[PDB]
Structure 1
Amino acid sequence: GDSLAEFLVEATPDPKLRQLMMSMAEATRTIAHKVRTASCAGTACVNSFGDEQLAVDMVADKLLFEALKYSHVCKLACSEEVPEPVDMGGEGFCVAFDPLDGSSIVDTNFAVGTIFGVWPGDKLTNITGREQVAAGMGIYGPRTVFCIALKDAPGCHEFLLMDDGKWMHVKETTHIGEGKMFAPGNLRATFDNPAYERLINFYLGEKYTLRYTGGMVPDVFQIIVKEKGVFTNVTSPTTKAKLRILFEVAPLALLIEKAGGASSCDGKAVSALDIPILVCDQRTQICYGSIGEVRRFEEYMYGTSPRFSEK
C-alpha cells in the first residue's frame, strides 16, 4: 500500500535509524540484481563490484560495508566472513550481517538472502539480542523482499521490490499460530541426541511437512509468511554448533518474536535475545516457531518449558 520511507517515519523518531534502514534496503536491491545476473560458469558464482570481479558473496560483503560507511551512522560493522569488527568512522549504530547466506547454492537457483542486526552504542560484544534497535533480512527468490522489524514498533513487516525499483509494504505479521511444518536443521544430531530423535519422530508421526533448503533466510522466513511451523537446529556429542548468534540467530530471533513467535536458544530454554554475546564468532543452537511449538521443543529437549509450560 505505502512505501518504506513512509513506514519508517512512523515506526521510529530517530532519523539516523531511518537512514540506516534505507541504506540496507538499497544494498539489498543491488545485491538482488547482482545475484540475478551472476555468472556461475566456473567453480564460483561471480559478479562485479566496481572495476573488480568477485564472487557474489564477496560482492555483497563489499556492498554492505559500503552502504554502512556512507550512511555515516554506523560506528562498527562486522561480517560473518571476517568476524572481527571494523570501524566505519560514523557514530550511532553497530551492525552485524551475513552478506549472502547460502551463497554456495546460488548456482542451484535456490532462494538465498542477507541477514543484518542493528545495535546501538559502540560494542559488538558483551551485548544481547534484545538490545537490538532493529533487524532485517533480504530474501532473494523469484521476488525480492525486504523483511524488517524495529524495536519500538509492533509487528514484522515485508516490503516487496516493485518494478519501479521502490519498496512497498505488502504484509505485516503479528501472530504465528499452530501448524504442521518443520525445518529440521542438523538432522544428523538425531543419531546420538535421543531427545531430538523423539521430537523429530513427533513431527513425522503427526504428518508435519518437511521443508528445509539449508539456507537459513528462507527456512525461517517461511514461518513468518505461513504464520506456522518450526525451525530446529540442535547440537550433539558428535555434531557441533555452526550457527552464529551475532550474524544470524539474534537478528532472526527479533524478526520472529516480533510477529508473534518465540525462540529457544543455546541449550538454555531462553530467548535468543537474552543470550550474552561475548565474542563475535560465537556459535549457538536455536529453535524458532510458534509459542506452542517452542513449548514442545523445550519440553522434549529439556523436560519442561520454564516460560510456557502450565504451572
Structure 2
Amino acid sequence: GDSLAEFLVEATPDPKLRQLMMSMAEATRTIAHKVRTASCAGTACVNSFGDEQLAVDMVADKLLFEALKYSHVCKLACSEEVPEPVDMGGEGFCVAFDPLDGSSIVDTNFAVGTIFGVWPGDKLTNITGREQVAAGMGIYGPRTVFCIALKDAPGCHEFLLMDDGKWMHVKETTHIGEGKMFAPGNLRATFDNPAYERLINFYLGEKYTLRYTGGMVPDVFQIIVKEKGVFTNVTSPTTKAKLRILFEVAPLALLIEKAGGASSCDGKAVSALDIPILVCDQRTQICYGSIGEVRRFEEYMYGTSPRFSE
C-alpha cells in the first residue's frame, strides 16, 4: 500500500497532528528494537537508553518522552508509571501513554505493546475519551505494528514496519461482526459476581474459542484483525479495578469503535469515550467487542442494554 506520511496528509488537515503521529511511529520503531535485543537474564528485562542500563518499561518511557519533546506540538505528557502530567515545552496536543503494556509477558516472548491517546488543548483532567483527536497502539510481536485511528478520518488503520525503516499501510478496519471468541480478563471475579459468572458460563457453553494472553494490547488488537470477539474486564466486591481510562481504556475505545465496535465502561452502560476522566490515575472496568457482543454484555451484567437492546 502507501506510506504513513502519505496516509496522514489525507486523514487530518492539521499538520501538527501529522508531525505528532510521525513522532509516535518513530518512537514505536525504536522501542521495537530495544525489546528485540533486551537481556532478560535476571527475570527483569534490561536495555540501554543512553549511558544507563534500565528496564524495558523504562527505556520505552524515556523514548516516548523524548519523541514528544522534539515534536514541538506537545503541551502535556503523562505516563502510567508517574500519573502526573508534565510540560514538554510545546503546544498543540496532550498525550497520555502506557509505555509497555505487558508486565508478565516480556520474559515469555509474548506480544506486548504501547498505548497512547492524544487530546487537544492543555488539560489531561476533566476530559472525556470522545475529545480525543487521535489514538494508537504499537504492537511488538513477530511483526511491528502501528495501529492508529484519527477522529477526522474513518476507520482503524494498521501500519507495518518495513525493512527500510518505514511504515506501510496494510489494513483498514471499518466493521467488526459476530463470532465466537472471547478474552475473559479478571476471571477471579466469577466468584463474587454472579452476573459475570453466568456470562462466562455462556461463553464456555456456546464453544467460544479462548484467546487470553494477559496483555491488553494484543487481546484487543485481535478483535480488530479478526473483526470479531469480546474482551471483558469486570470488577467485583473483592476484586478492585486496575485498568486506567486515560492511559489504556479510553484510547483503545477509540480504536475499537472507529473500527465498528462498541465499549461498556465503568459499569454505567455507556461508551468509554463518554466516561468523565477526573484524575489521571482514575481506574475503571471495560468490555470491548462487536455491537452484538456488547449488547449481550450489558444484558447479562445489568439486565438490559440501554443503547442496543430490542
What interval of TM-score do these two structures reach, taking the shorter chain for normalisation? over 0.9
Which portions of structure 1, spanning 4 or more consecutive aligned residues, are displaced by more than 2 angstroms? none
- CA–CA distance in structure 1, aligned partners of residues 107 and 232 of structure 2: 26
Alignment partner of 2:297: what SS?
helix
- CA–CA distance in structure 1, aligned partners of residues 183 and 219 of structure 2: 7
**CA-atom RMSD in angstroms:** 0.5
Preserved CA contact (<8 Å) 2:190 2:196: yes
Q: Deviations over 1:230-257 (max 9, x none)?
A: 0000000010100000000000000000
Alignment partner of 1:76: what SS?
strand
Q: TM-score, normalised by structure 2?
A: 0.99
Q: Deviations over 1:182-207 (max 9, x none)?
A: 00000011101000000000011000
Alignment partner of 1:83: what SS?
coil
Alignment partner of 2:259: what SS?
coil
Q: Deviations over 1:266-311 (max 9, x none)?
A: 010000000000000000000000000000000000001010011x
Q: TM-score, normalised by structure 1?
A: 0.99
Gaps of 5+ in 2: none
Preserved CA contact (<8 Å) 2:43 2:107: no
- Residue matched to 2:85: 85
Preserved CA contact (<8 Å) 1:20 1:68: yes
- CA–CA distance in structure 2, aligned partners of residues 163 and 182 of structure 1: 34
Report the Cα offset of residue 103 of structure 1.
Answer: 3.6
Preserved CA contact (<8 Å) 1:95 1:116: yes
Alignment partner of 1:147: what SS?
strand
Report whether the alignment pairs 1:23 with 2:23. yes
Q: Which moved more, 1:190-199 or 1:99-108?
A: 99-108
- CA–CA distance in structure 2, aligned partners of residues 137 and 192 of structure 1: 33
Gaps of 5+ in 1: none
- Residue matched to 1:115: 115
Report whether the alignment pairs 1:41 with 2:62. no
Alignment partner of 1:190: what SS?
coil
Aligned length: 310
Preserved CA contact (<8 Å) 1:56 1:103: no
Alignment partner of 2:188: what SS?
helix
Q: Deviations over 1:74-94 (max 9, x none)?
A: 000000000000011100000
- CA–CA distance in structure 2, aligned partners of residues 160 and 236 of structure 1: 39
- CA–CA distance in structure 2, aligned partners of residues 234 and 43 of structure 1: 29
Q: Which moved more, 1:100-109 or 1:216-225?
A: 100-109
Report the Cα offset of residue 104 of structure 1.
Answer: 3.5
Q: Deviations over 1:103-140 (max 9, x none)?
A: 43211000000000000000000000000000000000
Percent sequence identity over aligned pairs: 100
Preserved CA contact (<8 Å) 2:156 2:174: yes
Preserved CA contact (<8 Å) 1:32 1:140: yes
- CA–CA distance in structure 1, aligned partners of residues 89 and 103 of structure 2: 29
Report the Cα offset of residue 147 of structure 1.
Answer: 0.1
Report the Cα offset of residue 53 of structure 1.
Answer: 1.0
Preserved CA contact (<8 Å) 2:61 2:79: yes
- CA–CA distance in structure 2, aligned partners of residues 198 and 288 of structure 1: 18
Report the Cα offset of residue 13 of structure 1.
Answer: 0.6
Alignment partner of 2:54: what SS?
strand
Report the Cα offset of residue 43 of structure 1.
Answer: 2.9
